[PDB]
Amino acid sequence: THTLLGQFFQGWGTRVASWPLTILVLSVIPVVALAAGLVFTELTTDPVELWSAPNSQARSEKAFHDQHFGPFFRTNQVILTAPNRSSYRYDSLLLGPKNFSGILDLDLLLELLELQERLRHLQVWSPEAQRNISLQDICYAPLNPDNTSLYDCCINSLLQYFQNNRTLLLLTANQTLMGQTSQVDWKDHFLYCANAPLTFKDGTALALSCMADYGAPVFPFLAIGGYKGKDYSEAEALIMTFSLNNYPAGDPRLAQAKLWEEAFLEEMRAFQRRMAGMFQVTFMAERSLEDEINRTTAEDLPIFATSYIVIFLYISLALGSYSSWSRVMVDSKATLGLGGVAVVLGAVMAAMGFFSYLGIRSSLVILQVVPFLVLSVGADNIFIFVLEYQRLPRRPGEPREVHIGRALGRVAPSMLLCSLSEAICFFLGALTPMPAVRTFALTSGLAVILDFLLQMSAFVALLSLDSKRQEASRLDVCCCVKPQELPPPGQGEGLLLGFFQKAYAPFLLHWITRGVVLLLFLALFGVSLYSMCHISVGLDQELALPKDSYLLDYFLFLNRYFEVGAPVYFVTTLGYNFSSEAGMNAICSSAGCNNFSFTQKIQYATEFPEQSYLAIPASSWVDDFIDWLTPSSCCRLYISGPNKDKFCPSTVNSLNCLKNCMSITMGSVRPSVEQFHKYLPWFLNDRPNIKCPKGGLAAYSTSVNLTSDGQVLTSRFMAYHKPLKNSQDYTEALRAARELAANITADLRKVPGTDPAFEVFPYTITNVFYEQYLTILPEGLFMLSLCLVPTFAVSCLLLGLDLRSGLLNLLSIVMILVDTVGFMALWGISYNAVSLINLVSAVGMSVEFVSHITRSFAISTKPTWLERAKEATISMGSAVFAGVAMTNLPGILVLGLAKAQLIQIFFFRLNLLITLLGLLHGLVFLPVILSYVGPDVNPALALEQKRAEEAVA
Numbered sequence: 001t002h003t004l005l006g007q008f009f010q011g012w013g014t015r016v017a018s019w020p021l022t023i024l025v026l027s028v029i030p031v032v033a034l035a036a037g038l039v040f041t042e043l044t045t046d047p048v049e050l051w052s053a054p055n056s057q058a059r060s061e062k063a064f065h066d067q068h069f070g071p072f073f074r075t076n077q078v079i080l081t082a083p084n085r086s087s088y089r090y091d092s093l094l095l096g097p098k099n100f101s102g103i104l105d106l107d108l109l110l111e112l113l114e115l116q117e118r119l120r121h122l123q124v125w126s127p128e129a130q131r132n133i134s135l136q137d138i139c140y141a142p143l144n145p146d147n148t149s150l151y152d153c154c155i156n157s158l159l160q161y162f163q164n165n166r167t168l169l170l171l172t173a174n175q176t177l178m179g180q181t182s183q184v185d186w187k188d189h190f191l192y193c194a195n196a197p198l199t200f201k202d203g204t205a206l207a208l209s210c211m212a213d214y215g216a217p218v219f220p221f222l223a224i225g226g227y228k229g230k231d232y233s234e235a236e237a238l239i240m241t242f243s244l245n246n247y248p249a250g251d252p253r254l255a256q257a258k259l260w261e262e263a264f265l266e267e268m269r270a271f272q273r274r275m276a277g278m279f280q281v282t283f284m285a286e287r288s289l290e291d292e293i294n295r296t297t298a299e300d301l302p303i304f305a306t307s308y309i310v311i312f313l314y315i316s317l318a319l320g321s322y323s324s325w326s327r328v329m330v331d332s333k334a335t336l337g338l339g340g341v342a343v344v345l346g347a348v349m350a351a352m353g354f355f356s357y358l359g360i361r362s363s364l365v366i367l368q369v370v371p372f373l374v375l376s377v378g379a380d381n382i383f384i385f386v387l388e389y390q391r392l393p394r395r396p397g398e399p400r401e402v403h404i405g406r407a408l409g410r411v412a413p414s415m416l417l418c419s420l421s422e423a424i425c426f427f428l429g430a431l432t433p434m435p436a437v438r439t440f441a442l443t444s445g446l447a448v449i450l451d452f453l454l455q456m457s458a459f460v461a462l463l464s465l466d467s468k469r470q471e472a473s474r475l476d477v478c479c480c481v482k483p484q485e486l487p488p489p490g491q492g493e494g495l496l497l498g499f500f501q502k503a504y505a506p507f508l509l510h511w512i513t514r515g516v517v518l519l520l521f522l523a524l525f526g527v528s529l530y531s532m533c534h535i536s537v538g539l540d541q542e543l544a545l546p547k548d549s550y551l552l553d554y555f556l557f558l559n560r561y562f563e564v565g566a567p568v569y570f571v572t573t574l575g576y577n578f579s580s581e582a583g584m585n586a587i588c589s590s591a592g593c594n595n596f597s598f599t600q601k602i603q604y605a606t607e608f609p610e611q612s613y614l615a616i617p618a619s620s621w622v623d624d625f626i627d628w629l630t631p632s633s634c635c636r637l638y639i640s641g642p643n644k645d646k647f648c649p650s651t652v653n654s655l656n657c658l659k660n661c662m663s664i665t666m667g668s669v670r671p672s673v674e675q676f677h678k679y680l681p682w683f684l685n686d687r688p689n690i691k692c693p694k695g696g697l698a699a700y701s702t703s704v705n706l707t708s709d710g711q712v713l714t715s716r717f718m719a720y721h722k723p724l725k726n727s728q729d730y731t732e733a734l735r736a737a738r739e740l741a742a743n744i745t746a747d748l749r750k751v752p753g754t755d756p757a758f759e760v761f762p763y764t765i766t767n768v769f770y771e772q773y774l775t776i777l778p779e780g781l782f783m784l785s786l787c788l789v790p791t792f793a794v795s796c797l798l799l800g801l802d803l804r805s806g807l808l809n810l811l812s813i814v815m816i817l818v819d820t821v822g823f824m825a826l827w828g829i830s831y832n833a834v835s836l837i838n839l840v841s842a843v844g845m846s847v848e849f850v851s852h853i854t855r856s857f858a859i860s861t862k863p864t865w866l867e868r869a870k871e872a873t874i875s876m877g878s879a880v881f882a883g884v885a886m887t888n889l890p891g892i893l894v895l896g897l898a899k900a901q902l903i904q905i906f907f908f909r910l911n912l913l914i915t916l917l918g919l920l921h922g923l924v925f926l927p928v929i930l931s932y933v934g935p936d937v938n939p940a941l942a943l944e945q946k947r948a949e950e951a952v953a
């Protein structure tokens with residue numbers, strides 16, 4: 001069946017080389033017709049659409065949350081630290097001698113106040129809206145979310161303890177204690193605040209409120225960072241969080257938030273420049289990561305285009321015959337190199353265009369690296385074809401058409417094998433949950449297929465025209481005005497086969513070198529197999545960005561100085577009867593509630609923050625609700641009047657509403673079903689004052705989704721992750737949170753009247769990205785096994801290879817792949833979707849290294865194994881080296897300047913390892929192992945080629 005394709009491709013090659021210009025036209029027309037569809041490209045840069053599987057669990061959990069509570073707010077942080085400012089001591093009253101940091105000086109706080117109050121009143125022009133966007137339009141106001149003001153926006157900073165009042169910050173009082181008097185300053189209020197932030201009367205001889213201006217308590221971990229435990233006075237970093245209201249991807253209010261974020265960043269860069277010796281400013285907006293990813297994507301297009309220029313230039317001056325110094329410009333193949341690269345770029349653009357016709361949404365991070373891998377695969381085929389056509393000696397009085405036909409018929413089955421193997425590998429690499437890598441894989445897969453279809457028609461027609469322009473004694477690209485003259489046309493043997501015949505093949509196939517090489521490769525396989533175990537599974541941030549980013553400095557500070565990670569909501573899905581006494585007994589953590597309840601379990605989890613990645617015990621709306629419902633003066637009903645048995649708030653101090661919230665309790669307080677359903681909407685819309693410090697509107701306003709009639713559909717309990725620094729930390733944190741949530745639901749599902757489909761799930765904003773890494777290894781190994789299958793299957797069918805031949809190919813592919821993963825674990829390249837699609841591309845590509853040598857060893861007539869190995873090495877080892885290896889390496893070595901750590905790590909280093917191991921195995925190890933245990937001579941395999949050449953000659 002090999003020689004059948006030989007006959008077909010002989011016929012095809014002849015028929016194409018006979019009609020060059022017609023075939024070039026008929027081949028260019030569909031490429032332009034498909035590649036004109038690039039104008040439909042919907043370039044989506046948003047991280048949730050590229051890097052989350054929309055059918056995964058995390059996305060179903062996110063969808064449920066974002067439905068029942070609205071989406072998660074956009075955090076625009078600033079982490080300030082004064083490194084050169086020396087620590088001092090304070091002899092405070094009510095507390096011991098505290099050692100204060102340099103950052104907790106007064107002038108620095110007045111400078112942070114200036115910045116905070118400047119960013120409050122920041123305004124931007126909105127051309128879509130044709131007005132000035134104020135912060136109040138877009139800011140996340142937890143208290144009073146409808147008709148907000150600039151002094152109602154969620155701005156978490158140390159100076160919230162002084163409600164951003166500059167008079168309260170410079171304020172000093174005289175306090176006498178146990179006979180002795182001392183001057184109390186802002187330090188006393190700060191410390192008393194950082195201890196218990198839910199106070200309205202400071203205890204340090206000052207009637208100073210501790211709650212923020214917007215009316216919620218600021219916990220110390222949100223305001224200060226760099227301390228360790230309850231030693232807040234030694235805080236090294238101040239934090240200033242601007243929380244904006246997040247809206248769905250299609251809301252016209254998201255442009256407003258992003259415009260303000262851009263203005264925030266401009267103001268923060270100006271502020272960073274102004275304060276050089278004083279502060280060390282680091283900052284990010286929510287738009288920062290999407291903007292720093294897409295900045296560097298358009299800055300390394302010169303460094304990408306240079307790769308294809310260099311591959312063109314190598315292929316151009318590595319098929320040119322340099323014998324005499326008079327006909328170099330006639331021998332040099334500039335037209336063929338240019339044409340070959342043009343054909344491959346045609347194929348790539350056709351693929352991108354075809355996929356853009358179906359409305360598939362890509363990103364410039366995806367349409368950047370597609371041409372590289374497709375070209376590194378597609379250039380080798382053209383190189384090997386032209387090399388064979390060059391080496392194949394023309395029969396006497398034979399025309400060029402039949403010669404090109406014969407050369408193509410000779411090398412076409414091998415190129416069909418390569419192209420099919422690589423296309424299948426890419427289309428099996430396109431099973432990834434990540435839509436970005438899926439789009440990449442599918443585009444690359446089709447690009448390789450169209451590359452082959454163009455190489456068979458357009459490039460063969462082009463080679464026919466080049467051969468004609470050469471034989472007519474005209475120049476290459478300086479031709480058609482210059483048929484002048486040359487010395488004798490046909491010259492002797494080349495330098496490539498010269499080297500491979502006289503230096504290499506005798507050296508590699510020495511008495512000693514076979515034993516040494518074989519031993520050394522088995523040792524390398526052993527080391528690689530050992531080292532593959534210490535692979536780091538996870539794509540952390542600080543890789544997506546460049547190395548010159550303002551976000552890297554922010555991430556260094558966010559890792560070093562921060563005291564808690566992202567907040568995790570333990571969302572409770574539908575089918576909990578919260579009203580029942582038995583219901584709310586298993587959620588609360590007060591006197592009378594069940595032991596190992598919801599909040600008790602989270603509390604005890606946070607007691608061990610290293611095992612279960614939680615730093616703070618969960619907030620509880622039900623615990624604070626049954627706390628609110630006490631016979632104290634928090635909720636009271638009018639004893640009589642027009643508002644009889646109606647809620648008089650904690651603010652009014654009249655005698656008319658002296659009646660308590662419910663009856664005179666005889667122990668642990670529990671409201672009845674009617675009492676619960678009536679009094680919960682009051683609790684959730686009660687602002688915490690001095691009189692009643694317990695109130696729902698502050699924290700739990702949005703953490704309960706009531707029905708139209710006052711049934712609780714859902715509810716979320718807000719804990720905080722410990723500071724998560726690596727991708728492994730994020731993944732372990734998700735795993736541990738899920739395990740705890742499963743343990744919680746297991747106990748909550750044993751309550752009378754709970755639906756069995758009831759579930760507690762820990763939704764954090766970074767769940768969708770770091771969920772895949774729970775099961776990337778099994779998926780990856782299944783994928784690489786499914787990619788090793790068709791390689792062998794089609795390698796045994798198409799090439800028509802025997803059993804030993806197929807198994808030697810397979811053994812070599814497995815060896816290359818294990819070596820790649822071993823060196824991945826050594827160099828410090830992580831395991832993820834990007835590394836995985838590179839390894840699947842490697843499984844596909846390594847066939848180009850092994851298959852050519854193994855075939856040309858199989859189709860051999862030399863007496864002894866060593867002679868056949870030498871022949872295979874010299875002829876096809878030289879073709880495979882000069883083609884595959886040296887059209888990979890000049891392309892890869894240019895991506896070493898990419899500047900983006902993602903490409904610089906996963907597409908330079910990993911492809912360099914893949915290429916060099918491919919080279920080493922399929923030019924050092926495969927000749928030796930073929931010379932040892934290669935397949936036996938098949939005379940019919942070579943002798944029937946002559947019943948397939950002459951018959952259709």
Ligand SMILES: *[C@@H]1O[C@H](CO)[C@@H](O[C@@H]2O[C@H](CO)[C@@H](O)[C@H](O)[C@H]2NC(C)=O)[C@H](O)[C@H]1NC(C)=O
Binds near residue numbers: 068069705706713
């Ligand atoms: C409480 O949860 C309900 C669940 O139905 C939310 O109602 C849905 O809201 C989403 C987003 O606005 C809409 O797409 C659905 O059409 C709504 N469904 C129904 C049945 O009305 C509700 O929005 C949540 N409460 C609040 C105030 O947002």
Ligand SMILES: *[C@@H]1O[C@H](CO)[C@@H](O[C@@H]2O[C@H](CO)[C@@H](O)[C@H](O)[C@H]2NC(C)=O)[C@H](O)[C@H]1NC(C)=O
Binds near residue numbers: 579580581
């Ligand atoms: C949730 O449990 C409460 C009890 O804690 C149920 O309220 C009772 O419902 C029964 C059935 O009609 C009535 O006879 C009682 O008068 C109600 N009050 C009690 C017993 O406290 C409530 O029905 C349950 N939720 C459901 C089933 O939807």
Ligand SMILES: *[C@@H]1O[C@H](CO)[C@@H](O[C@H]2O[C@H](CO)[C@@H](O)[C@H](O)[C@H]2NC(C)=O)[C@H](O)[C@H]1NC(C)=O
Binds near residue numbers: 165168
């Ligand atoms: C910030 O707080 C200060 C001090 O409380 C406010 O200054 C006023 O506060 C008093 C009571 O509200 C007023 O009666 C005085 O006019 C004044 N007190 C002093 C001693 O100056 C100030 O108004 C607050 N900030 C704003 C702008 O509301």
Ligand SMILES: CC(C)CCC[C@@H](C)[C@H]1CC[C@H]2[C@@H]3CC=C4C[C@@H](O)CC[C@]4(C)[C@H]3CC[C@]12C
Binds near residue numbers: 305349
């Ligand atoms: C080595 C390079 C030049 C090979 C060609 C790569 C081409 C196909 C890539 C590189 C930059 C890309 C373009 C950059 C952005 C846009 C603008 C958009 O509104 C239409 C698509 C379009 C026009 C892209 C199409 C694909 C593109 C043109």
Ligand SMILES: CC(C)CCC[C@@H](C)[C@H]1CC[C@H]2[C@@H]3CC=C4C[C@@H](O)CC[C@]4(C)[C@H]3CC[C@]12C
Binds near residue numbers: 047048437902
């Ligand atoms: C085939 C590849 C090279 C095409 C581009 C892959 C890109 C999109 C991949 C590689 C690394 C990934 C990023 C790394 C981690 C983060 C941080 C997270 O908070 C938002 C998503 C984001 C930003 C990921 C989005 C998708 C990502 C940028």
Ligand SMILES: CC(C)CCC[C@@H](C)[C@H]1CC[C@H]2[C@@H]3CC=C4C[C@@H](O)CC[C@]4(C)[C@H]3CC[C@]12C
Binds near residue numbers: 920
């Ligand atoms: C095919 C193999 C044998 C050679 C591949 C090329 C070489 C240069 C590659 C393969 C493995 C790589 C090394 C593996 C990891 C480290 C440790 C690090 O602290 C310094 C760089 C260094 C030393 C890498 C440098 C580049 C490297 C040596």
Ligand SMILES: *[C@@H]1O[C@H](CO)[C@@H](O)[C@H](O)[C@H]1NC(C)=O
Binds near residue numbers: 089099
């Ligand atoms: C600074 O505070 C630390 C922490 O208590 C203490 O050990 C040390 O003695 C203090 N040094 C000075 C100079 O007061």
Ligand SMILES: *[C@@H]1O[C@H](CO)[C@@H](O)[C@H](O)[C@H]1NC(C)=O
Binds near residue numbers: 125
């Ligand atoms: C918008 O804000 C700028 C702040 O520089 C201000 O100067 C300008 O007057 C504002 N636009 C309008 C409509 O007043």
Ligand SMILES: *[C@@H]1O[C@H](CO)[C@@H](O)[C@H](O)[C@H]1NC(C)=O
Binds near residue numbers: 173174183
């Ligand atoms: C408080 O004591 C300080 C320091 O001695 C002094 O300057 C100030 O006048 C005193 N204030 C009052 C109210 O006595």
Ligand SMILES: *[C@H]1O[C@H](CO)[C@@H](O)[C@H](O)[C@H]1NC(C)=O
Binds near residue numbers: 746
């Ligand atoms: C939580 O889960 C189990 C249920 O399998 C429960 O019995 C026990 O209290 C907890 N288990 C562990 C290992 O903490």
